[PDB]
Paper text:
Specifically, the β-­glycosidic bond of 6′-P-β-glucoside is cleaved by 6-P-β-glucosidase (6PβGlu; EC 3.2.1.86), releasing 6-P-β-glucose (BG6; glycon), an important cellular precursor, and the remaining portion of the given substrate (aglycon). Here, the high-resolution crystal structures of [name] 6-P-β-glucosidases from Lactobacillus plantarum (LpPbg1) and [name] (SmBgl) and their complexes with ligands are reported. 6PβGlu is a single-domain protein that adopts a (β/α)8-barrel (TIM-barrel) structure, which is a typical fold of [name]-family members. The [name]-family enzymes utilize a double-displacement mechanism of catalysis with retention of configuration at the anomeric C atom of the glycon moiety.
Interestingly, the active-site [name] SmBgl mutant also showed some residual catalytic activity (0.8% of the wild-type enzyme activity detected for gentiobiose).
Residue numbers in the entry:
A (entry chain B): 2 to 477
B (entry chain A): 0 to 477
Write the structure that this text describes.
């Protein structure tokens, strides 16, 4: 085979997107519990707490909390070699600032992790995934507050210890670089728990939180390895490679400066220091960041073991916008459409070839092992009279990507730990809080009005993926 | 009130021993590879003759007699106010055949006198150990750098120079533009980079990779002994940086660009990181290229990484996926590249893209986080002397000006770490590619034509006083 024997095939999810039981076992209100439903072309509403008259899809989600044994069993039917999820911060520390963790909460993950380990499924765990306690947001302002660093490090330490011999693979902060787009409220609210107000420099406040998180990460990495040196602790960034529209030298420069801005987090996770261009940017913009000598030391001592990343699409930038003499990157303004590729009904361009670019790029910059912890295809699914979703459009997409990651390993020589398709069981979509935007090999009976039996049934892609794993990639 | 560039920025001018020196037999200097290369023209290759052949014109034999003129010439460098001066040590001046037990004293003394003369004016020498001029005996007798035995010979040479000049030269580089031979389809680079003489049947690519590996090992070893002799020496690598742009956002074009860069600059990853990128090893399998490569070599490479990246910039390239039957995205420099439709070009069809210099600087910075040194940049054009007795080379001034502006942006806005800036061919010399005098790069005009005649008189061009003023104001006033 072309992939190494122990290659980690699996499937990915996040606590707040699937678990449900948002109030069970003392679980506290998380940022996710206050975001209402939306849709393609309509933003999710972020409320000042749980308001009457609103629908909050994450509250009940797909009730994985009461269903996990049945679902894990399916994951084992496909033959997962691993399973990625996050530990819900608000199940361990309801409000965030407690001196002691919620035991019921630790127990739930004990029970979940034991369940996977029965079938030989190695857990892969993300510490923060879009679900910090909503209390740290109201009470402290989220990761704008330096003291929240220690709250995260407490939470991580607790988690490392309880699971030091059950969980081999960890990631600190989910897609730490989504907030690179400070222009809208989603990323800053979910990466970082930032609610903006009048006169706030949104960009300035984003960089501070990002810095606190990068520093929280480096401290957590360090502490993990002390507890169990064998732990593998990685970072996690959303990779959307950014292509220059043409060989016009300005487009070229725009592309390079955009990548630099979108992925400086990686350089810090990896090299242990900020690149010079960020400081130059801050000076230019008069952005001041609370950045200490101790921070600088934590960052250099807390670099990651591998890079985990999501991949769904690629972008294209050009130099069309004038009044940009410094070549700033505006995610909401500088991006144009790639004429050479197709897209989803949500307009996420489909570019499997970009997965290979990405893998090569990470490899060339960083020379660390890599882990595709999210890749997937969100689409409308229908049920055929035969009772099964025939999702060949999903199979085609996953398929084309696998073929490219294999080329990268076999022809290019990148070290890739594994591959984890995203939303492996139908779940509440992050960007939209939509059920109708489905990603799973497994269909869950529930719609965007929250009606349905919630019964699960396999999709056409279920057996397909099963054969993929069993063939270790030789059968696409 | 500070400048955008550091106060100790190393402004200077660059050349190579075999293109200006002459005295190609003086002091027992041996025949080098350049001494058997005839003169050419744009479109017409120089001829690589087997030995020095009667009835053939070899322009490097006399060049501009800098060997006799150096003192007055260095005086001109001082007049413009150079902070540094870059040249190479002619290998064949130290080891005429290359395999001697003991070095040549007269050759050593020459560079002693030359370096002394620079320092009399406060000009810091920047030295390149191998610059397209290895001993020709090593070609005929050993097969050049295709022979593991030449690693030793080179390191012995590096060692002698490091010793002799350990308190005179602070800035060194090992192999000039070591990556040119990435273009192995044509004879030039492989023969100048590496002393390779191909015959019918050769796997040109495979042989290039071997010589390159040996030079990379020889480079690591030189770095290590240089530092042992004096840990303060700055010893760098030297690569030709022609950045390679994808034609369009077609993913296939994007990938051709990334893979081309990977192919053309792996040299740098080795110099900097101290090991090969995996993609090379993978590539070598697909091609069944066998490279003689010991654990000892592994160790040397990993331990002799460089202090800084010296590079040359002249232009940007463009690539696309138009070529058929390339399912693995191999890179052929003579076939995959297309013209940039957005820029202008010199009379020798070199494209002018100063913004590409800024891209280059960020690329090195992003990949390697080392100090960079722009050690060659220049504009080759036809000069004519006006009635005031001076060449009015505004074209040159404009070219250099534009590049300098971009590099300032890289520093002042992008934060790259740049040690200095060395316009190439600061004095009119014999060109690499063509062995031409008419392709002038200089701030200083040398009266000598392509038929070998002229008084060899030196005189300032208009750019002379321009550069002087660029330096005096540390780039403030371009
Ligand atoms: O549910 P969604 O909206 O389809 O998102 C998919 C899945 O991937 C990750 O985020 C997806 C993307 O959402 C935006 O922030 C940007 O377009 C991208 O940067 C980002 O990758 C999340 O990890 C996950 O929770 C999402 O459900
Ligand atoms: O060949 P020229 O006109 O002298 O210009 C090159 C000059 O700078 C450096 O570049 C070498 C060039 O040789 C050509 O054959 C290639 O096509 C170019 O890509 C390459 O840059 C040399 O280091 C120097 O010796 C040359 O004089």
């Amino acid at each position: 085979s072309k992939l190494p024997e122990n290659f980690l095939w699996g499937g990915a999810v996040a606590a707040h997107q699937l678990e449900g039981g948002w109030q069970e076992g003392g679980k506290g209100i998380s940022v996710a519990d206050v975001m209402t439903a939306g849709r393609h072309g309509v933003a999710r509403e972020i409320t000042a707490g749980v308001l009457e008259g609103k629908y909050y899809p994450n509250h009940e989600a797909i009730d994985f909390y009461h269903h996990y044994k049945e679902d894990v069993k399916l994951f084992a039917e496909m033959g997962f070699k691993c399973f990625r999820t996050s530990i819900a911060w608000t199940r361990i520390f309801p409000k965030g600032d407690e001196a002691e963790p919620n035991e019921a909460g630790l127990q739930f993950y004990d029970d979940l992790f034991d369940e996977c380990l029965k079938y030989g499924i190695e857990p892969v765990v993300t510490l923060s995934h879009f679900e910090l306690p909503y209390h740290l947001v109201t009470e402290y302002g989220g990761f704008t507050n330096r003291k929240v660093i220690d709250f995260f490090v407490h939470f991580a330490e607790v988690c490392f210890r309880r699971y030091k011999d059950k969980v081999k693979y960890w990631m600190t902060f989910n897609e730490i670089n989504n907030q690179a787009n400070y222009q809208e409220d989603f990323a800053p609210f979910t990466n970082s728990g930032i609610v903006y107000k009048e006169g706030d420099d949104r960009e300035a406040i984003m960089y501070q939180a990002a810095h606190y998180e990068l520093v929280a990460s480096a401290r957590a990495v360090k502490i993990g390895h002390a507890i169990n040196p064998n732990l593998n602790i990685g970072c996690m960034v959303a990779m959307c490679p950014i292509y220059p529209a043409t060989c016009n030298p300005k487009d070229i420069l725009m592309a390079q400066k955009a990548m630099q801005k979108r992925y400086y987090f990686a350089d810090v996770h990896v090299h242990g220091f900020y690149p010079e261009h960020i400081f130059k940017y801050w000076e230019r913009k008069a952005i001041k960041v609370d950045f200490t000598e101790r921070d600088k030391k934590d960052l250099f001592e807390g670099t990651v073991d591998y890079i985990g990343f999501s991949y769904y699409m690629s972008f294209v930038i050009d130099a069309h916008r004038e009044n940009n003499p410094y070549y700033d990157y505006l995610e909401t303004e500088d991006l144009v459409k790639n004429p050479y590729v197709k897209a989803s009904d949500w307009d996420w361009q489909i570019d499997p070839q970009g997965l290979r670019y990405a893998l090569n790029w990470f490899t060339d910059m960083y020379h660390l092992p890599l882990f595709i912890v999210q890749n997937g295809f969100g689409a409308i699914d229908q049920v055929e009279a035969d009772g099964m979703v025939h999702d060949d459009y999903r199979i085609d997409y996953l398929g084309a990507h696998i073929k490219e990651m294999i080329k990268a390993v076999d022809e290019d020589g990148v070290e890739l730990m594994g591959y984890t398709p995203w939303g492996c069981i139908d779940l509440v979509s992050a960007g939209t809080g939509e059920m109708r935007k489905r990603y799973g090999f497994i269909y869950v009976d529930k719609d965007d009005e929250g009606k349905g039996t919630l019964k699960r049934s396999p999709k056409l892609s279920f057996n397909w993926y099963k054969e993929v794993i069993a063939s270790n990639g030789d059968d696409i």
